[PDB]
Amino acid sequence: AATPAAVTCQLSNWSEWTDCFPCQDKKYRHRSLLQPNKFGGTICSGDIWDQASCSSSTTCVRQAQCGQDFQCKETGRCLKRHLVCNGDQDCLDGSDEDDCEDVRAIDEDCSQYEPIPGSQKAALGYNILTQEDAQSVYDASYYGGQCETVYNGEWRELRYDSTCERLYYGDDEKYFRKPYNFLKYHFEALADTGISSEFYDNANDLLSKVKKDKSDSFHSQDTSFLNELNKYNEKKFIFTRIFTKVQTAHFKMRKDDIMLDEGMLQSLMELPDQYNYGMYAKFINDYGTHYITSGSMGGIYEYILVIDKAKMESLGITSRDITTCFHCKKFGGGKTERARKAMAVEDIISRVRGGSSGWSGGLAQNRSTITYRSWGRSLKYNPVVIDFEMQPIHEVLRHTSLGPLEAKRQNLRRALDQYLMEFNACRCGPCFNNGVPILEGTSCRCQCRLGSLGAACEQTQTEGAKADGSWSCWSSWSVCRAGIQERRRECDNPAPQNGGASCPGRKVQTQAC
């Protein structure tokens, strides 16, 4: 197909200003994303949320609300009072630790151990729509006054002392302090690799020929006929696929008494008990659709090579030659046809997720024991999350130290179901040639793989390739009158092309009315 036409971005009108929230003195409103600029297209100038200053004309007390437990001024963080003067600032204002001339309240000397390096990423929220980290959900640094420590199994670092003659291992890295939000952090060295490689080749070749000669004399005639065919076929196929998965630690987030981040805490305190999609969608946008509660830290290497080649050739000939004499005469007449075609494709993908730009690049280029070992060393200093379980952001609220948030949680569930509908990449147009549709902000792209090009990846450089289809999204819910509400979807965005697979999901989805 040629490219689809561009579409302009479109937003609804502003919703009516939310009444001024007393503690904020702020008014909020939202628009709806009626259309992203699927292709080309003017981007919308404006954001889909807006806020303005106000005056409430009413006070709020909430600074006092929690004050049985120590409540900071800057933040809603409300602390068990033994954390006051504990020796470790537990809210960003430090109001728990100022004026603590009764220093006897300190809990322990633990600051000799740094926090687990790379623990902060586990604290971040996750957006399933974009596979991007959001703002922090967990507090990455709150310890709850505990000095709980994790043994760093890789602490051994060579040192040399020229004043002696000793080569010895230093010990600073030997332990980390575990932040309160981790139930488990567990160093463990594993690797696995799998390699598969395959070759199939066939060459098939036939020749066939007849010569038929007949001669008679009475005057004379001589005739020769020929038919001949050559037909040669070759197929070559090579596949290889390497996976290497180093694990260096596992983590698990605490399922109870979760201490939310200061920013999430404040923003959740700002949301109304009344449902307001603008507010809760802003919350889901900032803190992500999901949060993480499992971990593997590690490195991955993946390599794929496919080569396919074919050759076909054929030649055909048919001929007659004649001579006769009565004066002697000679004739000939015939036809020959020939064809050749040759095809090759070579596709390679190598990717490294891991610990240094240098040796991630080097290992992406040249798989070897040198790059494997040097990248493995780099995985010591910068492991990356290789696997994580996650759950919807609202399930965090059930487990907070804030107690119940039933109404806010149900609001956030409803808002999430709408957010996961409204910003789905379904609204980016058909990415052809197995291009990947992406929606970001109010705009769309196709990420086009190298065999594909153009605003929709629509122009593959070759004549065409087998490209699987993808679903449009689900339609609106039915205006149900029976107890059942219904949603339909079809594998047409794009349809399966050049013999590509159907997309595998469900056509029909159903809900209680």
Place this chain on the structure above:
Amino acid sequence: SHIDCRMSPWSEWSQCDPCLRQMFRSRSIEVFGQFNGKRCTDAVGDRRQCVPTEPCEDAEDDCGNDFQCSTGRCIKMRLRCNGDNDCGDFSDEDDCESEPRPPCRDRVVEESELARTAGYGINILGMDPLSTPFDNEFYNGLCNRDRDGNTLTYYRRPWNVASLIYETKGEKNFRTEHYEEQIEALFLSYSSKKEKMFLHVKGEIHLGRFVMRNRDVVLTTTFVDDIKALPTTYEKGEYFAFLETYGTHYSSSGSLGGLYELIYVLDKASMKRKGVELVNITSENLIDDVVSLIRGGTRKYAFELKEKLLRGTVIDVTDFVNWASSINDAPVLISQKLSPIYNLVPVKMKNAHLKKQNLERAIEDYINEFSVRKCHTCQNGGTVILMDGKCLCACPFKFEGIACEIS
């Protein structure tokens, strides 16, 4: 004829805006000009001195309990003496003789340049990056030490950078597609020949990702002052000057890295067709197009790698590793998530919402003004490109010339 570009008459003069003592005018570009007609270089807006007609309203308010620095930023008093230069001027701490109360408790710490430059401004036209509107030197008096990851060094995270994670990835994609045909067949007959090759390689290296903070963010003194100078009255040329100085968007999150790219294309072919209908066709072509790109890393390694990629020479992985490490010295903003610059207009600023709405209008104007939409169609389906105050057309097809007039 080609067309030298054309602009509207001037708008009527605004009224004199008080405090800023000036009147303004606007003038749209009706037609960009094209085909080597003269550029619209002339300014889209104009301004003039005026003796103010009426009382000015002050810009300052007493912050109250917060200190009020020489630069006008107000900081909560725990930041007094803190020694972090929390106002960009040291009036947070220059007052203080003693008790500096310094954060990071005598621990080894560094400033990180990646965090300092985080949150680049962006002009949507060309996606060009600009200086960060964020201060990134205010620390809110926190320490929040993070590891450089590629190096055993700890840097203090600036307050506005909510995350800066060195989640390093390195990829290489390569494809070769290679094709040959010979065909020697209405009463047609043939001698068609083809020799086609596509080779395409790109390798992205991601050094890390920043996320800017969604709330309570602190902006540079010059940016907030330029919002102060911004006329309340929607004077398009002044808002365009602001957008030109800071861009229309900021990266609320960005991936930093480097990239190499190489495209090799060949198409050698010929046709002959002969026969009779119920025919004397001949043609030949050669096309042979090499393009190479390197982004990021230090010159000294980057260009050597770009060369060794253009050469068929087998790359010594030492060179690739050298450039890929040098990406840490000079990263590129290989990706970002944009948010409109007006979301950085601080709330509770005077007429903040008005300035926000007027910036949204000014962005609408800026996009539609320098959009090729109001430019002349290419003659033969070539892409029209608004280059700079002029349109020129380029054809990917065999057509040629600045309007694709010919082939």
Place this chain on the structure above:
Amino acid sequence: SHIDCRMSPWSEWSQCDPCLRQMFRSRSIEVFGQFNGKRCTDAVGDRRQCVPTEPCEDAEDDCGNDFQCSTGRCIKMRLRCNGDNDCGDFSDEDDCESEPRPPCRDRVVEESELARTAGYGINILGMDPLSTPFDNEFYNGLCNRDRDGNTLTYYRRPWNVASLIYETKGEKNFRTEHYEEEKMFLHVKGEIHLGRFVMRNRDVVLTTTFVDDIKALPTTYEKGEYFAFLETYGTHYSSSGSLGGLYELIYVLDKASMKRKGVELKDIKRCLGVNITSENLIDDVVSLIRGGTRKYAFELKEKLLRGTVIDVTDFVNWASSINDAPVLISQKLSPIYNLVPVKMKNAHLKKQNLERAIEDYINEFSVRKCHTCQNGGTVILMDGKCLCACPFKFEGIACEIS
């Protein structure tokens, strides 16, 4: 006969401007010579001294509270003890010697050669003295600073510069193209994009010479003197642009001889990524280079002229030279009349006169002001002399040989 320069009278000799005490005439040039006839190098603007007619209109204004900087650039007083030369002649620092309070108090930071020379004035027909009107040694007491990754040196950013981002973007393209039914064409390009500057639109701090040369502009449209101004500082300045280096080479072949002097491109491509003496049309490359420290580009030329593709060493040498002598790859020019400080006395009329002077510059010095060539050739104004050139093996000063 060839065309000797055609010109015009000393028209409309003015009365005096009271404060400048001078009177002007705006002469004109009518044909830029032609065909190696006498080129034009006469003046286009003329003036004489005046015994003043009447009072000067109290044109002076002065700072008030703000610092009476010795060259009249009233500057914010927090600068007074800057130690940073914010007053154009240190007379701030000369006036506040008693205590230092330096910006960049503790940071080790430098000033970029780029930044000082950033925002060049440009004449749409040529080049100019005092090329930068911008001061670019005024820092307004700020320590906004940016790091060159190639050296990790911090360069502080002068206050006119709203952004300064260092980059390394390098591209190369080699294209060869032929057809028959015939054509042959071939170009090579490279770009080495070192970095990007963007300039402040408002409160620009212009040099003292520039403000003096806005005092030296009559409030009435003396086209000659405004031409003197437009030629001195510029018709436009670069408001943003990309610094670096670039080159392009071209070498187009006779395909017929190509197929038998050589055989095919691989005979020559093998030299890039063993030679035959006869094929040299591919070797005699036309070369264009922009920017770069000349020694390395000269050594490149000294190899390419022999048909030797330069070694990667010489390319990287040239590239690492580029930092020593960059050029603007790309710009967005804006007209100098925007730099007219809004509070200057009569600032607006002077801007409007500059707009007229810009127009007169274009209308005057343009090929429209010369006749047609002797037979369909192309006439170019060059340095201000209309003379002719034709590509297709024409000859003669008007392509008279065909």
